[PDB]
A paper describes a structure:
A PHD finger signature is found in plant vernalization (VEL) proteins, which function as accessory factors of the Polycomb system to control flowering in Arabidopsis through an epigenetic silencing mechanism. During vernalization, VEL proteins associate with Polycomb Repressive Complex 2 and are required for epigenetic silencing of the Arabidopsis FLOWERING LOCUS C (FLC). Here, we use structural analysis by X-ray crystallography to show that the VEL PHD finger forms the central module of a larger compact tripartite superdomain that also contains a zinc finger and a four-helix bundle. Our evidence argues for evolution of a divergent function for the PHD superdomain in vernalization that does not involve histone tail decoding.
Author numbering: 135 to 321
The structure:
C-alpha cells in the first residue's frame, strides 16, 4: 500500500518504490505533483515504439548522464531527446522545453522565472538541430544572469521578488514568448 495520499497504489515485494507516483531515479514522489516537472516514457509522436510508462523528475534526468541529456563519455548524447532510464526508449524533450518557457513568460515570482528558464537552458545545451530556438533562450539567460547571478543559486531575497520589479523582467519574458514561437514555426 503506497503512502502517497494522491496514489495509494498497492505495492509488491519487488518494489523499492511505487512505479505509478514515484521517480525511478530518486525513488521519491511529490506532495502536489506538477506534471510539467516530470518526464514520462510514452509512445507519443515522434517516437512510437513500445514504452514502459515509467516517470522521473525532469531535474533528476538533467542531473544524471544515463538519460542522455547531460553530455558524458559513456552514453551517446541525444539532441532534444532523452533515454528512459528504465527501458532505454528515446523520448522527446521539446514538449517539456515548451512547457517550461510558457510558465516562465507568465511567472510573477522571480524564483519561478529563474527555475523554469534554467531548466530550458539545460535541456537543449549544445543542440545542433534546435540552435535557433536555444539561442533565444541563451540570450534570455545571459540577460537574467546580469541581474540575479547564476539562475540555480539565486538568493532568497531576490527569489521572493516580483518579476515586474526586475530591470530586465519584461524583456526576458518577451524572449520566452519568442522562443516558443520559434519552436512552433519550425515544427
Ligand atoms: Zn504511489
Ligand atoms: Zn527524482
Ligand atoms: Zn521506458
Amino acid at each position: 500500500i503506497c503512502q502517497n495520499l494522491a496514489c495509494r497504489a498497492t505495492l509488491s515485494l519487488e518494489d523499492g518504490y511505487c512505479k505509478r507516483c514515484s521517480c525511478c531515479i530518486c525513488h521519491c514522489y511529490d506532495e502536489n505533483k506538477d506534471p510539467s516537472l516530470w518526464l514520462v516514457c510514452n509512445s507519443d509522436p515522434p517516437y512510437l515504439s513500445n514504452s514502459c510508462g515509467m516517470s522521473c523528475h525532469l531535474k533528476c534526468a538533467l542531473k544524471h548522464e544515463t538519460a542522455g541529456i547531460l553530455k558524458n563519455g559513456c552514453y551517446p548524447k541525444l539532441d532534444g531527446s532523452f533515454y528512459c532510464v528504465f527501458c532505454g526508449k528515446v523520448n522527446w524533450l521539446i514538449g517539456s522545453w515548451r512547457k517550461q518557457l510558457l510558465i516562465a513568460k507568465d511567472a510573477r515570482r522571480v524564483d519561478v522565472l529563474c527555475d523554469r528558464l534554467s531548466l530550458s537552458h539545460k535541456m537543449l545545451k549544445g543542440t545542433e538541430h534546435y540552435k535557433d530556438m536555444q539561442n533565444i533562450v541563451n540570450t534570455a539567460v545571459k540577460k537574467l544572469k546580469k541581474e540575479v547571478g547564476p539562475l540555480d543559486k539565486v538568493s532568497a531575497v531576490m527569489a521572493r521578488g516580483i518579476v515586474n520589479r526586475l530591470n530586465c523582467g519584461t524583456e526576458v519574458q518577451k524572449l520566452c514568448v519568442s522562443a516558443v514561437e520559434a519552436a512552433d514555426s519550425m515544427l
